[PDB]
């Protein structure tokens, strides 16, 4: 294909990063992907007429801040900041992940999208308004998703590609 994109999915354990990744790639809901396994996948898609090679890093594993991990994260071109709408802690952690991205990217303008996952669940504890206000403060889009139903999944990843395109033309 034509353009390759290095996307990175970050967020607390259990918010659905693996399930979102497998949905995009396989169009199936995996309800228990090994929570410790970090891996990357490829999706070849046409987005707005451009053939796109999406490399998606589904982050997982031990929390560690070695120079080596910083450099691996530094290679990502755009990030999904994922929380789960039924998990306030995962939303409170969003600040941490945004700041780690900025730290290793050494920049305040990195392509990012805010993702509220598990939108199918009725047990909401994070208001849609709160997430919109945060994403507005960050200057990034906000997409509600459900890896279970595939709601918003294509929109989230494709919006991230569009944010990378915008960044490149700045
Ligand atoms: C006590 N912690 C601090 C406040 C909340 C809580 C957990 O925060 C958390 N947890 C992780 N793990 C938790 C256990 N399983 C999954 C991995 C992380 C893994 N790697 C990186 C990471 C490392 C280095 C550079 C990055 C540059 C960009 C992006 C990332 Cl994501 C980066 C982290 F920052 C992680 N932060
Ligand atoms: N109802 C619902 N459950 C989900 C959704 N996404 C993930 N899960 C479930 O939430 C748990 C965490 O999923 P995982 O994909 O393993 O989260 P990660 O730890 O961020 O990779 C698993 O039991 C998944 O089946 C979603 O959109 N809706
Ligand atoms: Mg996982």
Q: Tell me: domain 3-169, CATH 2.60.40.3500, correct?
A: no
Closest CA to 157 of 31, 39, 53, 30: 53
Minimal-distance CA residue to ligand 1 atom 10: 63
Closest CA to 79 of 99, 52, 51, 63: 99
Within 87-165, strands assigned E span: 112-117, 142-144
Contact present, 118 and 106 (Cβ < 8 Å): no
Residue with tokens 């990195």: 110
Closest CA to 63 of 29, 83, 93, 108: 93
Neighbours of 75 (CB within 10 A): 11
What values do phi and psi take at 51, rounded to 5? -65, 125
Minimal-distance CA residue to ligand 2 atom 12: 14
Q: Is the dihedral of CA 159, 161, 163, 166 positive or negative?
A: negative
Question: Cα(111)–Cα(40) distance, rounded to whole angstroms?
Answer: 19
Residue with tokens 């990175």: 8
100 lines ligand 1 (CB under 6 A): yes
Q: How far is the CA of 120 from the centre of ligand 2 (A)?
A: 11
150 lines ligand 2 (CB under 6 A): no
Question: Which DSSP helix (H) or strand (E) runs through 5?
Answer: strand 3-10
Closest CA to 12 of 50, 75, 63, 51: 63
Helix segments in 45-108, DSSP class H: 67-74, 88-92, 94-105
112-117 vs 3-10, strand pairing mode: unpaired
Q: How far is the CA of 169 from the centre of ligand 3 (A)?
A: 33
User: Residue ranges per domain, the chain?
Assistant: 3-169
Resolution in A: 2.1
Q: How far is the CA of 25 from the centre of ligand 3 (A)?
A: 14
Q: Which residues contact 74 (CB under 8 A, 6 or more apart)?
A: 104, 105
Tokens of 58: 């589904």
- Put residue 106 in one of left, alpha, beta given phi > 0 → left and psi -120 to 50 → alpha: left
Elucidation method: X-ray
Question: Cα(62)–Cα(36) distance, rounded to whole angstroms?
Answer: 8
Question: Cα(124)–Cα(20) distance, rounded to whole angstroms?
Answer: 18
Exposed, middle or buried by CB within 10 Å (0-12, 13-18, 19+), for 116? buried
């Amino acid at each position: 294909g034509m353009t390759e994109y290095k996307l990175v999915v970050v967020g607390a354990d259990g918010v659905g990063k693996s399930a979102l990744t497998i949905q995009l790639i396989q169009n199936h809901f995996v309800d228990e992907y090994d929570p410790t396994i970090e891996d990357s996948y490829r999706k070849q898609v046409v987005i707005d007429g451009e053939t796109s090679l999406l490399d998606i890093l589904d982050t997982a594993g031990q929390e560690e801040y070695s120079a080596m991990r910083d450099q691996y994260m530094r290679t990502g071109e755009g990030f999904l900041l994922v929380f789960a709408i039924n998990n306030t802690k995962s939303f409170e952690d969003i600040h941490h992940y945004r700041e780690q991205i900025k730290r290793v990217k050494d920049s305040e303008d990195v392509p990012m999208v805010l993702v509220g996952n598990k939108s199918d669940l009725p047990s909401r504890t994070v208001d849609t308004k709160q997430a919109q206000d945060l994403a507005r403060s960050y200057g990034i889009p906000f997409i509600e998703t459900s890896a279970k139903t595939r709601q918003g999944v294509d929109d989230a990843f494709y919006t991230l590609v569009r944010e990378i395109r915008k960044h490149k033309e700045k």
